[PDB]
Amino acid sequence: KVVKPSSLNSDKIPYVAPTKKEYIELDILNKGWKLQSLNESKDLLRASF
Amino acid sequence: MQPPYIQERLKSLNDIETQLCSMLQEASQVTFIFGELKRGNESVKPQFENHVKQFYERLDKSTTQLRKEIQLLDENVGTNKKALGQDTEKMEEQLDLLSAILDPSKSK
């Protein structure tokens, strides 16, 4: 009822030029959240056991 | 009481679930130790090998013994009945009571 649906149309945008800046931090911080997940994994398993 | 064979069968089964409980407990300690191993202290590193080896050897032989029990089930096949004599034994005891009634020197 809001609108006749033709809303989403294909479009093109270029990929941002890569560098050392963001991937290394992205992956080390992913390491951080997965070390977190390991910690809560161990804690939950200990509580369950 | 039950014949002995059933007695050692139930003892072996009880040993089986106690071994399973020990396996679960050792899983708990190995999960515990891996956390600090990931933390970064290498002192408890030697204990890790021992814990893993004991965990695996506890997991294996328990299942092996249970397999032996299930195998025993295979050859144990072929290897109110009491009522057939029940009245008789009742009969016996009743007459015994009469004897106690019949002799006044034993009613003390």
Feature tags:
part of a larger assembly; 2 chains; A: mainly alpha; B: mainly alpha; 3 helices; elongated; transcription; Divergent transcription; Mediator; RNA Polymerase II
Count the strands of chain A? 0
Number of helices of chain B: 3
Compressed to H and E, one letter per element, the order of chain A equals H
What oligomeric state do these chains adopt?
Answer: part of a larger assembly
PDB class: transcription
Keywords: Divergent transcription, Mediator, RNA Polymerase II, PIC, Pre-Initiation, Activation, Transcription Factor, Gal4, Gal4VP16, transcription
Entry title: Core Mediator-PICearly (Copy A)
Chain A: Mediator of RNA polymerase II transcription subunit 17
Would you give an account of this structure?
Chain A: It is found in: Nucleus. This is part of a larger assembly, with chains A (49 residues) and B (108 residues). Chain A is an all-alpha fold. Chain A is built from one helix and no strands. The longest helix of chain A is centred in the C-terminal third of the chain and has 29 residues, at 20-48. By secondary structure, chain B is an all-alpha fold. Chain B is 81% helix and 0% strand. Chain B is built from three helices and no strands. Chain B has helices at residues 4-39, 45-76, 83-102. The longest helix of chain B is centred in the N-terminal third of the chain and has 36 residues, at 4-39. Chain B starts with a helix and ends in a 6-residue tail after the last helix.
Spell out the blueprint of helices and strands.
The structure is cut from a larger assembly and holds chains A (49 residues) and B (108 residues).
Chain A: H1 20-48
Chain B: H1 4-39, H2 45-76, H3 83-102
Helix pairs in contact in B: 1-2
In short:
This is part of a larger assembly, with chains A (49 residues) and B (108 residues). Chain A has 49 residues and is an all-alpha fold. Chain A has one helix at 20-48.
